[PDB]
């Protein structure tokens, strides 16, 4: 079977054709969201992504190949392969490289490169192109609220008319202060008991989180999930921890009016 969407990537801009053209090695680059059929992606059951026709193709298999149309039938077998893991990533099988937005500008064209599991490697297949917004409640059932570039993460009782506990949920896979939009969730390193703290949106691996079917928020680079301190709120601590299921690592979205 095969169904339609666009592909949404960093700084929620989407996986786009350039200039609309179908010529074999057209690159694909990042342009704002639309419905022009240069943004419509085609996912079928053989593994391909198709536009105008034709299909996503790796256009070499290397650290820093180019990513472009070309036709179907006459690809290399291997280059027009993909998989779309749960964590938002999209990969050529063949090689194990992945989409990459190196830069956040329109006009960016993607590349295939190593895993790193940056944001910029982080996307969404979605008809909606635009940020999902919401409350993300945990432990106690407060509510994660940021309070200012550079500073902490924490956890407040639950207010609708606090816009610091709005959450734009884009589709690079970044969890960006609604009314600030960039500014990231960003982790103050890799290892267990770093800080979450609030920083400009850079595409890093310390500013990527997967919603996992247990009601964690993984950092899929170190592995470690979001973790209210010591289960002691007045701490005013958000950390990264591995995951133990524990009440202080358990968090839900909640859609905001
Ligand atoms: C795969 O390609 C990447 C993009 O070119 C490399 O990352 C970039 O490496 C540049 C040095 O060659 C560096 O100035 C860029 O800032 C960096 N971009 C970022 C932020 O990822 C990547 O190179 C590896 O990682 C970088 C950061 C350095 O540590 C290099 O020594 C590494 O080789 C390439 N990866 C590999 C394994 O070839
Ligand atoms: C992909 O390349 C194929 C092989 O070159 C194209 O098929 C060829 O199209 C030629 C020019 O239109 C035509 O003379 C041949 O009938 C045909 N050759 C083969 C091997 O099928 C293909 O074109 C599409 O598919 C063919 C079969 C027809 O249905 C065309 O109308 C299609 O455009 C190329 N695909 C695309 C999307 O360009
Ligand atoms: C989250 O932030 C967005 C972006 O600033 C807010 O969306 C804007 O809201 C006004 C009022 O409805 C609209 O006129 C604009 O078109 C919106 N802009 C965009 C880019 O969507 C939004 O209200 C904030 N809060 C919520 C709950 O989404
Ligand atoms: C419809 C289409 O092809 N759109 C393209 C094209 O847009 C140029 C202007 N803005 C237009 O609407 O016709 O070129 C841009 C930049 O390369 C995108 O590819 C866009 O999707
Ligand atoms: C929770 O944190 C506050 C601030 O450090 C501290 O005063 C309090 O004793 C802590 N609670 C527990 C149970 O340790």
Same mark, same amino acid.
């Given at each position: ?16 054709? &350039? ?8 690159? !694909? ?20 992504? &198709? ?22 039938? +006459? ?27 190196? &830069? ?17 490697? /982080? ?23 940021? =309070?200012?570039? =550079?500073? /902490? ?9 606090? !816009? ?30 770093? !800080? ?18 247990? /009601? ?6 170190? &592995? ?10 007045? !701490? ?16 839900? +979205?909640?859609?905001?009016?």
């Amino acid at each position: 079977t095969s169904f339609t969407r666009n592909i949404v990537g960093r700084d929620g801009l989407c996986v786009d054709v &350039r200039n609309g053209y179908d010529t074999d090695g057209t690159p !694909l680059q990042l342009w704002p969201c639309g419905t022009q059929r240069n943004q419509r992606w085609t996912f079928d059951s053989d593994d391909t992504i &198709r536009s105008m026709g034709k299909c996503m193709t790796a256009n070499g298999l290397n650290n820093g190949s180019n990513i472009v149309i070309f036709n179907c039938s +006459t690809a290399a077998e291997n280059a027009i392969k993909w998989e779309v893991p749960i964590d938002g990533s999209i990969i050529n099988p063949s090689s194990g490289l992945v989409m990459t937005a190196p &830069r956040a500008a329109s006009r960016t064209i993607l590349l295939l490169e190593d895993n790193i599991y940056a944001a910029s490697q /982080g996307w969404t297949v979605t008809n909606n192109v635009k940020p999902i917004v919401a409350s993300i409640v945990g432990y106690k059932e407060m509510c994660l609220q940021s =309070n200012g570039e =550079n500073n /902490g993460v924490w956890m407040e009782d639950c207010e609708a008319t606090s !816009l610091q506990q709005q959450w734009a949920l884009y589709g690079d896979r970044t969890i960006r202060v609604n009314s600030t939009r960039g500014l990231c969730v960003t982790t103050n390193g890799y290892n267990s008991k770093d !800080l979450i703290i609030i920083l400009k949106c850079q595409g890093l691996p310390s500013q990527r989180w997967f919603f996992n079917s247990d /009601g964690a928020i993984v950092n899929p680079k170190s &592995r470690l999930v979001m973790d209210v301190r010591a289960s002691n709120v007045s !701490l005013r601590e958000i950390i990264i921890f591995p995951a133990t299921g524990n009440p202080n690592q358990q968090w839900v +979205t909640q859609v905001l009016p």
